[PDB]
Amino acid sequence: SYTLPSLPYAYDALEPHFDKQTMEIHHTKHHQTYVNNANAALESLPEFANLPVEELITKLDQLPADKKTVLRNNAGGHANHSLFWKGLKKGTTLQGDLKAAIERDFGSVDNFKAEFEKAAASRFGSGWAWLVLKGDKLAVVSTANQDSPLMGEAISGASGFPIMGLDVWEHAYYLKFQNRRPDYIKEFWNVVNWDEAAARFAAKK
Amino acid sequence: SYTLPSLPYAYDALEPHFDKQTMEIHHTKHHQTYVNNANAALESLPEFANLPVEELITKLDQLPADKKTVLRNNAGGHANHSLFWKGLKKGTTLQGDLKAAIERDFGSVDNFKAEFEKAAASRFGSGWAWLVLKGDKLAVVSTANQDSPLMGEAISGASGFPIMGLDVWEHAYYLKFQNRRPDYIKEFWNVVNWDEAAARFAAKK
């Protein structure tokens, strides 16, 4: 069974950038719901129920037909949120190999941010903006709803191993920012955990 | 070009059910944005700009390829919101031929209500729940994002002429209801405009 991970910090640890009220709801209601609903669909499926979540979402086509969508959405959401929480932290600095790569693939940190802000702002409806690693090259993609690049192109419209990501469902920003997603996206640069991003980039997969 | 319609009522006309703060933002920001982006896309398309928005969204396949998505989303948004505002009104009563048609087609009003709530609640991510007329038979369907049943099943996954509809984008309910979409949904029953739904049904077109 999956369990909701404890946050690696207090709900107010990303203030004054991300609001504690939302962090609390986002985690204890939305993410909890994805865990609960994924577990419910997995009750009958011991062979799958026993897989890691990042593993499960890479094999949605091996699921019975009547379970593919429920687990795409809920195991998707669990995998994305698990990554999200760990990919946020104040006080980090983009640096080292990661930064070199970003400059190699985007020209400058500012160009990269710009492409990230674009993809994050242009995702219409619910979804996520990602910095992925594909074939040694850093790219910016986005996905719909709780889809992940780990699901593959056929399913999610994108691929690649996620280095870091931004949730752009309105539940992630509506209380503080309402319609002003671009403000939220700019705020993200303050709380994005470059240390975890660097480590994920170091592991390389 | 399209104009942002004024609402039929003050921003607090749907209290204590739908919050005035959301009505104002929903209208002056989100709807205003769909209108702007639809108009911007339409600048170079006089032949399409000439059509009522409701007819335009039936002709998305006839647009230039590079125009299809932007207008799908934004003209969709404009058409759906124009319907929405007109389709909200307190103290109406489901009666006459429409009430009869619902009883005929769903078995009862209660069966209909349950099917509608199910659709509204199960729409994962952003979208709408609809009562549509398909031929001479009413049905409940939902669409993603700003898609409309008017766009047809190839595009939206649904078809039929909308009689009434519920916006289940988080921006429509997050300030007051947060994650509690079912609370928002039950509240819809207090503000749905059965007379306009009836008026749309009578017309059938």
SS (HEC) of chain B = CCCCCCCCCCCCCCCCCCCHHHHHHHHHHHHHHHHHHHHHHHCCCHHHHCCCHHHHCCCHHHCCHHHHHHHHHHHHHHHHHHHHHHCECCCCCCCHHHHHHHHHHHCCHHHHHHHHHHHHHHCCCCEEEEEEEECCEEEEEEEECCCCHHHCHHHHCCCCEEEEEEECCHHHCHHHHCCCHHHHHHHHHHHECHHHHHHHHHHCC
Judge: B25–A178 Cβ closer than 8 Å, yes or no: yes
- The Cα B175–Cα B187 span in angstroms is 14
From B62, B89, B116, give the residue that closes a domain. B89
- Do B153 and B195 belong to one domain? yes
Q: Are residues B55 and B108 in the same domain?
A: no
DSSP 8-state code for residue B83: H
- Residue of B174, B175, B176 to mutate when probing chain A, most A C-beta within 10 A: B174
A-chain CB neighbours of B174 within 8 Å are 170-171, 174-175
Same domain, B82 and B107: no
Number of domains present in the structure of chain B:
2
Instruction: Give SS3 for A192.
Output: strand
Is B61 part of any known ligand binding site?
no
* B161-167 and B127-134 strand pairing: antiparallel
Q: Under an 8 A CB cutoff, do A170 and B175 touch?
A: no
Of A80, A72, A61, the residue nearest A142 (C-alpha): A80
Provide the number of CB pairs (under 8 Å) joining chain A to chain B.
53
Residue type, A203: A
Rg from Cα positions in chain A: 16
Query: Which of A69, A89, A109 finishes a domain?
Result: A89
Q: Which method, experimentally, gave rise to this model? A: X-ray
Residues B61 and B151 in one domain: no
A34 and A75 in one domain?
Answer: yes
Which of B63, B89, B115 delimits the end of a domain?
B89
Strand locations in chain B (E): 127-134, 137-144, 161-167
Question: Is residue B24 included in any domain, yes or no?
Answer: yes
Residue B165 to residue B156: CA distance in whole angstroms: 15
Tell me how close the Cα of A171 comes to any Cα of chain B, in angstroms.
6
A130 and A43 fall within a common domain: no
Q: Residue B46's domain spans which residues?
A: 19-89
How many CB atoms sit inside 10 A of residue A73's CB? 19
A17 labelled as ligand-binding?
A: no
Written as one letter, the residue type at B142 is S
Whether B9 maps to a domain, the answer reads: no
**Three-class DSSP labels, B29-46:** HHHHHHHHHHHHHHCCCH
**Residue in chain B nearest A124 by alpha carbon:** B145
Kindly state whether residues A68 and A151 are assigned to the same domain.
Answer: no
A195, two tokens: 């240390």
Q: Say yes or no: B49 and B97 in one domain.
A: no
Does residue B115 fall inside a structural domain? Answer: yes
Separation of alpha carbons A109 and B50, rounded Å: 44
Q: Do A84 and A99 share a structural domain?
A: no
B126 and B143 both lie in a single domain: yes
d(CA B140, CA B158) in angstroms, rounded, equals 10
Tell me if A177 is assigned to some domain: yes
**B72: closest chain A residue by CA:** A124
Among B25, B30, B83, residue whose Cα is nearest residue B200: B83
Give me A102's structure tokens: 């970003």
The experimental resolution of this structure, in angstroms, equals: 1.9
Long-range contacts of A99-104 (CB under 8 A, 24+ apart): A101/A138, A101/A201, A102/A138, A104/A138
Residues A140, A79 within the same domain? no
- Count Cβ atoms within 10 A of the Cβ of residue B20 and give its class: 0-12 exposed, 13-18 middle, 19 or more buried: middle
Q: Which of B24, B81, B171, B178 to mutate to test the interface with A (most CBs of A within 10 A)?
A: B178
Is A119 domain-assigned?
yes
B113 with B136, same domain?
Answer: yes
Reduce the DSSP state of residue A9 to 3 states and report it. Answer: coil
Asked if residue A26 belongs to a known ligand binding site, the reply is: yes
* Separation CA A114–CA A101 (nearest Å): 16
Alpha carbon of A185 to those of B26, B61, B86: distances in Å?
A: 20, 33, 34
CA distance B148 to chain A (A): 14
User: Is B13 within a domain?
Assistant: no
Closest CA to A149 of A106, A93, A205, A198: A205
Please name the residue of chain A whose CA is at the shortest distance from the CA of residue B33. Answer: A179
For residue B4, tell me if it sits in a domain. no
Candidate from B125, B127, B179 with C-beta closest to A29: B179
A30 is in an annotated binding site: no
**Strands B127-134 and A137-144, sheet pairing:** unpaired
**A10 domain residue, yes or no:** no
What is residue B76's three-state secondary structure?
helix
* Domain harbouring A67, CATH code: 1.10.287.990
Task: Give yes or no for A40 touching B (CB within 8 A).
Answer: no
Put simply, whether B34 touches A (Cβ < 8 Å) is no
Domain at A200, CATH number: 3.55.40.20
Residue in chain A lying closest to B28 (CA): A179
Does A30 reach chain B within 8 Å, measured CB to CB?
A: yes
Which chain A residues touch B24 with a CB distance below 8 Å? none
Q: Would you call A178 an interface residue with chain B, using a CB distance cutoff of 8 Å?
A: yes
Kindly state whether A111 is in contact with chain B, defined as any CB-CB distance less than 8 angstroms: no
Contact B169 A171 (CB under 8 A): no
